[PDB]
Design an enzyme around this catalytic site. Structure first.
Site, mmCIF file in Angstrom:
data_model
loop_
_atom_site.group_PDB
_atom_site.id
_atom_site.type_symbol
_atom_site.label_atom_id
_atom_site.label_comp_id
_atom_site.label_asym_id
_atom_site.label_seq_id
_atom_site.Cartn_x
_atom_site.Cartn_y
_atom_site.Cartn_z
ATOM 1 N N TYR B 139 -2.045 51.200 -3.662
ATOM 2 C CA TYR B 139 -1.531 52.480 -4.176
ATOM 3 C C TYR B 139 -1.923 53.617 -3.228
ATOM 4 O O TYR B 139 -3.094 53.952 -3.083
ATOM 5 C CB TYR B 139 -2.046 52.690 -5.606
ATOM 6 C CG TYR B 139 -1.728 53.999 -6.297
ATOM 7 C CD1 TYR B 139 -0.649 54.805 -5.907
ATOM 8 C CD2 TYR B 139 -2.474 54.398 -7.402
ATOM 9 C CE1 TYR B 139 -0.365 55.980 -6.576
ATOM 10 C CE2 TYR B 139 -2.196 55.576 -8.076
ATOM 11 C CZ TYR B 139 -1.141 56.364 -7.661
ATOM 12 O OH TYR B 139 -0.871 57.530 -8.329
ATOM 13 N N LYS B 167 2.672 50.732 -3.609
ATOM 14 C CA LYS B 167 3.141 51.899 -4.355
ATOM 15 C C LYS B 167 2.984 53.103 -3.431
ATOM 16 O O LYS B 167 1.873 53.567 -3.182
ATOM 17 C CB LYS B 167 2.369 52.093 -5.665
ATOM 18 C CG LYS B 167 2.851 53.298 -6.475
ATOM 19 C CD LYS B 167 2.037 53.505 -7.714
ATOM 20 C CE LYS B 167 2.419 54.820 -8.423
ATOM 21 N NZ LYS B 167 1.471 55.132 -9.543
#
Lengths: 302, 297, 295, 295
Positions: B139, B167
């Site tokens: 992320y 992400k």
């Protein structure tokens, strides 16, 4: 502002206490006690516990409270104790403030809550809530834009430091125009210089003390700078700052917290000089320098 | 990366409901999970930034992970955001995600303290080990984390053993294209809802976002419109999403979404945790009108 | 302003071995662009090395490009300087040479207030004497950080017909389009062109259009026809080239490709720009050959 | 280059209501500085509005200042432009007018590599033909972010005799002094002057020295006498003025104080700078009166 007058006793040079860990990265209680005494023996005015330097943001609330409790047992009444209780969460910050009160700390402190953008009004409420839970302990607002991402204006800093219950500002900023501006607006505010590598210049600009990580291994140097400046001996002040910065240069290379823990390891204070993951170990090529530094510092001291 | 191909799609970044005492509201959590399933969402990303992870304890985060699994395991894909600053704390949550039967784990680049790139890699390695077979979703959110990974560093992270997705909460769509070009099979989630259509065009193959909780079907519609070459519908949907996002930015995004969900009869109390404040009451008519609009649609 | 809509090459300024204007190569580059099917040229911009030229040198380039291309394609004169008065001079000259529009970068180096920026554009527009103004926003280089509201006020000034948006923020691109449905809105960063068009841009101005402007025209066409895969493929091919040019230095890498295309005699930028590292020459040579064989 | 050590005013360039150079006011401002007891002048710098003047205008100002001040105080010519060739023309002119040194801001707008910065300085130093160079570092305006290692390389180039360090990082100030014990090191931000001296600067160059240069000289004196209280009191008084100047806009504020001191006829900066907000005039007049009575 009377809250500033009432916090006068917090003025000084306070070490930002490291948290020793053992080989399994649990609290090393015996090393924590040794570290606290070692700081007292350097002539430090007080300790700032559970701050950035204490690796608070990789500890749980329960771990932070244990450290706070142990430091109070060791040092309460002997030197000033400021409990850094700041979390992102207000509620968590309040729990630690309540515990600091219970353990008999002289003050609390909270970093401007980070990660999520909060409005200035939200910041102000955060401090108010923590001040209430501190139940009479004065608040040291902790400003460190480099790590927090929080970019307060001078007008915002002025509002924060004059909230009911605020008695000091830990100004970890290298902007010495703003340091002077804060002093000029608040003549009685306790104003700690936060970056050790500009301590002498921060004092000249208007700080009346400091809180720093390198004070753990050479806090008497910073005491010596305050003394030199008070006496108007500018050459001694510059010499000491220069020696501090030679050490800071090395610690920046090694990693600051782990470099300090390693020096304290060679001073026989800390048993295992690790920081908590994801901090890695000190690179072994720096060990001779760090040992050499440890030897240098004890010889000028003892 | 072709292994984790099952993780592709549009996943809501799940909000965590609280009550007026700031405690977890488990009833509203369950309702919100079912609301997302009924919207046709592909999955849920649980305990992320949008989930207010960083104002919860590990125990609270675990309680939420457990309930979501109970509600949704086997019905939609489940990604557990387990990231903390601490590696060990992140490992505890990864082990819990595995126990609850999540399909994947995720962790934000550890923040506040500067860590070296090598320290970031070891952090992800340790978490992947604790996830014990659950694939990792790296992320990246530079705006909030303060971590400034180079493209080459992103490349190293996404090819660590056990990593099946990125992400990418970044508005740099050059880098989005560069990541797609380097990793043709990588699951690549667009993180900024207000450029979703453009992110897909640059190379993202789905997304994870906060606003999907209230209008996830619009993002599925963008995916559909772009697959059919219908640029016009894709643009119209993005424009409508951005009209909403403008408002949410004014109101505060998480608390605005929770207030919309409150008017949709899903969330009992639309509060975020302190230090987040409440929604300014002047916005409530706009937020209520939006809920009605979205429900009618 | 509708006739300003399209794909416009940010024209490079060729120099000779002594760093003076190479007029013959300039003429060749202008024609080369027209033959690629570009809609127009944006002259004396960042890409033109405007800020290492004197005002007289900039006027000389403007005059000559107008000689070569007036009537055949659209011509936008970037007249921006830090100084308003200097910017006005170039605007007056653009008008004299018969340019279709003027443009000015937000004045840089010194911080100016937003109203000072507004007055700057108003003054330049007056001097432009009927030529529409293209506001030029490039925060990464200018250091000027305009809010969306400030951009809205700027692009609605009397006389403003367009915005060259050299920003990678495609939320803001969409917001601008939504606020101003009829505004001519040029995508400034070549490496997100397809995505910028999707967000709301209705054309572009860019440095790499000098060597592969037909690819960007191709992206516009593909998107218009709903051929998303072709659009993505073209953007990807453009980005492969942009990766290389970023490694080599973009203006000098472009000039070097154009040199291997027999357009530019000497592919130097002006000091303090240095030369291309000689180890990249095989790649740039291969690139020129590929692009020439591609048409 | 010990002879360059000191407190040097960054000279303002006076203009008239037509935006032309006001040469009569330039001569007066030069003489006013000399009578304040300033050590020298830094001419055509940021404060002198270099980047809204032509090369010819910059030369005219340089020539006039030398006429007025050569041999009486030290004179440093800021010759810096984005262009190396333009910077070289000004360096050659500084030499011809008998300046003591030249200076150049790190060239800005376009990103240049560190090697390109170095070659830029080498070229200007060559054209200065024996005048020492003052490397001018101002990250906040130039956008150039040099490392300490890069600064170390620059200040050790053959012909470099000083560094003008307009940076508020007083760790780096100390590190520079530690590395180069003999380097002439000018504090660039007036509002930290006392602190910069303590960190290692051995003088300064600043815009506010035009109206209160004696205060900064008083700080240098107080610190050498070991009188810290007076050094702080003086710095505090400088910062009270600086607070006001930042509210009004610094250059135009300084020019307005100078106007009330009967030195500058018309206190205008060049467009796009606007005029001082008239509500500040009472404050600016009172400051003029205060400062005249203090001296």
């Amino acid at each position: 502002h009377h809250h500033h007058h009432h916090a006068t006793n917090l003025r000084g040079v306070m070490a930002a206490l490291l948290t020793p860990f053992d080989q399994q990265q649990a609290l090393d209680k015996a090393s924590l006690r040794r570290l606290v005494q070692f700081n007292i023996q350097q002539g430090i005015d007080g300790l700032y516990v559970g701050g950035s330097t204490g690796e608070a943001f990789v500890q749980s609330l329960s771990e932070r409270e244990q450290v706070l409790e142990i430091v109070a047992e060791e040092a309460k009444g002997k030197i000033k104790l400021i409990a850094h209780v700041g979390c992102v969460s207000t509620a968590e910050s309040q729990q630690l403030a309540a515990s600091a009160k219970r353990y008999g700390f002289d003050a609390v402190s909270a970093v401007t809550p980070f990660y999520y953008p909060f409005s200035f009004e939200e910041h102000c409420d955060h401090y108010r809530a923590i001040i209430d839970s501190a139940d009479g302990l004065p608040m040291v607002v902790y400003n460190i834009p480099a790590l927090s991402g929080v970019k307060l204006t001078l007008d915002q800093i002025n509002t924060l430091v004059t909230l009911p219950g605020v008695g000091a500002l830990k100004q970890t900023s290298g902007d010495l125009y703003q340091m002077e501006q804060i002093r000029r607006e608040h003549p009685d505010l306790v104003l700690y210089n936060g970056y050790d590598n500009i301590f002498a210049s921060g004092l000249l600009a208007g700080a009346d003390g400091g809180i720093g990580s390198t004070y753990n291994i050479m806090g008497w140097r910073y005491q010596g700078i305050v003394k030199a400046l008070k006496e108007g001996d500018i050459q001694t002040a510059q010499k000491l700052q220069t020696e501090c910065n030679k050490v800071i240069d090395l610690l920046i290379k090694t990693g600051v917290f782990r470099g300090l823990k390693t020096v304290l390891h060679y001073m026989d204070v800390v048993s295992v000089p690790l920081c908590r993951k994801p901090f890695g170990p000190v690179d072994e090529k720096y060990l001779p320098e760090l040992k050499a530094l440890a030897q240098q510092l004890m010889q000028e001291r003892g």
